[PDB]
Design a protein around this ligand. Structure first.
Ligand SMILES: Clc1cc(CNCCc2nc3ccccc3[nH]2)ccc1-c1ccccc1
Ligand SMILES: Clc1cc(CNCCc2nc3ccccc3[nH]2)ccc1-c1ccccc1
Lengths: 325, 324
């Protein structure tokens, strides 16, 4: 079968903690009364959630209410436990309360309010310094949650809230987050297509915090090159082909041979043969003001097939690309 | 013209503003699952109309608590289920996990999350009393906010797993929805914990009944006197209260609400001075008593249901400054 693998950092953080910390199935959730909140307006809508802006009528403070469709109760317990464990961590969305409406009994999570700025509106106004500044803020959140033995497993621009006026950033939507246990085989149906690491696309289940570093690399590549998304797959199989068109099919086979991975037969007719490209090839007149040798070197160290060779969040924070922050 | 009406000072109109689906338990449709998923292990307790068992859910090998109900009144069973479904997941409220019937007996049964009850009182410190009293208040402020009065607050209805510092308020069979101006049956709660409103047959009571019962439990814990007000019948229970609170304030209460005192009180009530709470302090309990505890007790144990602290006001009392 496949060769086992483990994280290069924070490997045994959950092993050395009592079960209470990571055993979310045993976690007792206490659901308060949603009458303390008045819903103001709808902000967004997910596959299993609906996000509203609301007011806490006991202190007149704005909050964000995430109403969850109870499609899987174990998944709701997992998200709550992780949010409670990470509560107050740097740049982590702050869970303020857990409530249920008395008549509907629908689970709802109450968070600190964030005055988000638009992704398209920010895209063209962001300077090189801004990109470094906010990349460093996400790394603070990732190094923290990895140190707490949690993999976000859903990093993408939609899951990063920014209040640009206040230079405030929050990593949100922990619904896909999981506790890291060395040697554990995880479900690969995580994250979002454009941000899925090659480990997920080749069905290598023994992945770790390094999956987040791949997703972060995809975000960085989209920001510096103004190409959104950077790896534009049209299905999960095609996604690996788009990565292969940049990283090359030679290093893909070296990766699958190193871990004795069995490639799905659906790859047979679509994978082809591709050369490894130079990061400089993506530089153009519209994006050259965001690109630098430091940015390309940092990107090259995140976007690697081999999950074990990618920079850890702590190694990434020490990169020359961040010397100016 | 009869007794003066009264309403709750807090959460007065919570049920009035909710659709009838929430509080109309008579219309609630109960779906009874198959009790074959549970195997009874042992008897934990026995009530007037129920037996509580420890059981094992054979589908996940997890312990549960099974309450088998004698179907003496189907409306009462629907009421309890609706309240438990409404409060499901609330802080320190026993969690209803399933509703089942044994295929052959067809006896109603409620399945709850397991609670590992400690035996216990002799070992509880001043801190422990403050901690557990605050946990009960979280449960009461929550259920009151959900428009429900427990109406049977007493030590037997409080399960504590001391090792894990976990507390659950159980036995919601006497619980009711609060509707302002509604006249309720006074034959509720357990004798030692009945509020004076019940004993003088003042039917328009509210959540404040639970705050009286909580005050009885507090007095019994800090003074190590169980029960605190030891009546031998419902009429004598008011006399035991009047021996502490005095008869002057009892007459002020009945006059404020134009209550007619039952003639059965004529020969037994007597005349009693208002006692100082310090009179109950002794060598055996002085380590549990403090000025803060006595001030807090004085604000719960009042004849006038409207003057008692609400659960939310109680949580802000100095007696709880030392708890998280
Ligand atoms: Cl990662 C990022 C994100 C965004 C804005 N994303 C918000 C999407 C959102 N809004 C929401 C409202 C409601 C619910 C969910 C929401 N998610 C803008 C820029 C960047 C960025 C990061 C680092 C460097 C440079 C740029
Ligand atoms: Cl010291 C104490 C002890 C208990 C324990 N009463 C037994 C619960 C029970 N119910 C049961 C039903 C069925 C079967 C077994 C049962 N056991 C409750 C409350 C307190 C207390 C009171 C005031 C303040 C702080 C603590």
């Amino acid at each position: 079968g496949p060769v086992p693998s483990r994280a290069r950092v924070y490997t045994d953080v959950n092993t050395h903690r009592p079960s209470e910390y990571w055993d979310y199935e045993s976690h007792v959730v206490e659901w308060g009364n949603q009458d303390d909140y008045q819903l103001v307006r709808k902000l967004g809508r997910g596959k299993y959630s609906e996000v509203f802006e609301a007011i806490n009528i006991t202190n007149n403070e704005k909050v964000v209410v995430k109403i969850l469709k109870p499609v899987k109760k174990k998944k709701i317990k997992r998200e709550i436990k992780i949010l409670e464990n990470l509560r107050g961590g740097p740049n982590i969305i702050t869970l303020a309360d857990i409530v249920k409406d008395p008549v509907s009994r629908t689970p709802a999570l109450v968070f600190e309010h964030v005055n988000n700025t638009d992704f398209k509106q920010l895209y063209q106004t962001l300077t090189d310094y801004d990109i470094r500044f906010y990349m460093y803020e996400i790394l603070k959140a990732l190094d923290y949650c990895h140190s707490m033995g949690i993999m976000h497993r859903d990093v993408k621009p939609h899951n990063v809230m920014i209040d640009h006026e206040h230079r405030k950033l929050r990593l949100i939507d922990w619904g896909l987050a999981e506790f890291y246990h060395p040697g554990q085989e995880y479900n690969v149906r995580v994250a979002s297509r454009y941000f899925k690491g090659p480990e997920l696309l080749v069905d290598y289940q023994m992945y770790d915090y390094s999956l987040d570093m791949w997703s972060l690399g995809c975000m960085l590549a989209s920001m510096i090159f103004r190409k959104e998304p950077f790896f534009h797959g049209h299905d999960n199989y095609d996604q690996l082909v788009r990565i292969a068109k940049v990283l090359g099919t030679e290093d893909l086979y070296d990766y699958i041979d190193k871990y004795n991975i069995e490639l799905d037969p659906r790859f047979n007719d679509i994978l082809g043969r591709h050369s490894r490209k130079r990061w400089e090839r993506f530089v153009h007149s519209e994006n050259q003001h965001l690109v630098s040798p430091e940015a390309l070197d940092f990107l090259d160290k995140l976007l690697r097939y081999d999950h074990q060779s990618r920079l850890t969040a702590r190694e990434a924070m020490e990169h020359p690309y961040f010397y100016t922050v």
